[PDB]
Homo-oligomer: A and B are copies of this chain.
Amino acid sequence: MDIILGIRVQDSVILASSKAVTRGISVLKDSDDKTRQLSPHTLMSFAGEAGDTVQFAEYIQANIQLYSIREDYELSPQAVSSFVRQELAKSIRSRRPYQVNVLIGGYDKKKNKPELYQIDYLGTKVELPYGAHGYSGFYTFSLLDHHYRPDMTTEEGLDLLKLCVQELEKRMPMDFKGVIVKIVDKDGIRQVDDF
């Protein structure tokens, strides 16, 4: 699919993902949720080749949920991100690689810190205060470089995120039909229904 963004503030991680699905000439859907809950305090957004994206996301989801049941314990965002990276790093030298890029936003309940991990289809992992995949960064990183503050509140983060989406809606050629925004914090995962 197209645009996926992420920003880590003081006490939470915010992921924004486009709603459009386009097969060639037509926009088949304008309300698609490009994300899966891996665990109560870990959310993964994704974008890449059709089919592979959902297949990969649900596969990761199933594996983490299996771990949760087996150990009766939630893996740290760092641990989940490492697992995901390894799966993609394994995939890149396969017969047919997963063509999927992801952002992993989690809240570590042990350290009481929000964490954002950017991983591409090659298995390239980086921890970041803010991140993006595809052409999204090209428009948004300059704004984030200027405004981002780490002590930012969640509300200040959403405002900075609106400024990013406005720039994208001005300068990007493709109509991505707006974004679904989700927040990850100490209380879990919730969706901002008005954006």
Contact = CB atoms under 8 A, between A and B. Distances in A.
A172 interface: yes
Interface stretch (A19-27, A32-40, A121-129, A156-164): A19-27
Contacts of A173: 20, 22, 25-27, 174-175
A interface, how many residues as a size bin? Answer: 10 to 19
Nearest to A175: B175
Which of A22, A138, A169, A171 has the most chain B CB atoms closer than 10 A to its own CB? A171
A133 to B, nearest CB: 15
Nearest to A2: B173
Contact of A171 (B26, B170, B171, B172): B26
A8 B96 CA distance: 53
A175 B173 CA distance: 6
Contacts of A169: 175
A135 interface: yes
A139 to B, nearest CB: 8
A47 to B, nearest CB: 15
A89 to B, nearest CB: 29
B171 A174 contact: no
Nearest to A173: B22
Nearest to A24: B173
A135 to B, nearest CB: 6
A172 B170 CA distance: 17
Interface of A: 20, 22, 25-27, 30, 135, 138, 169-175
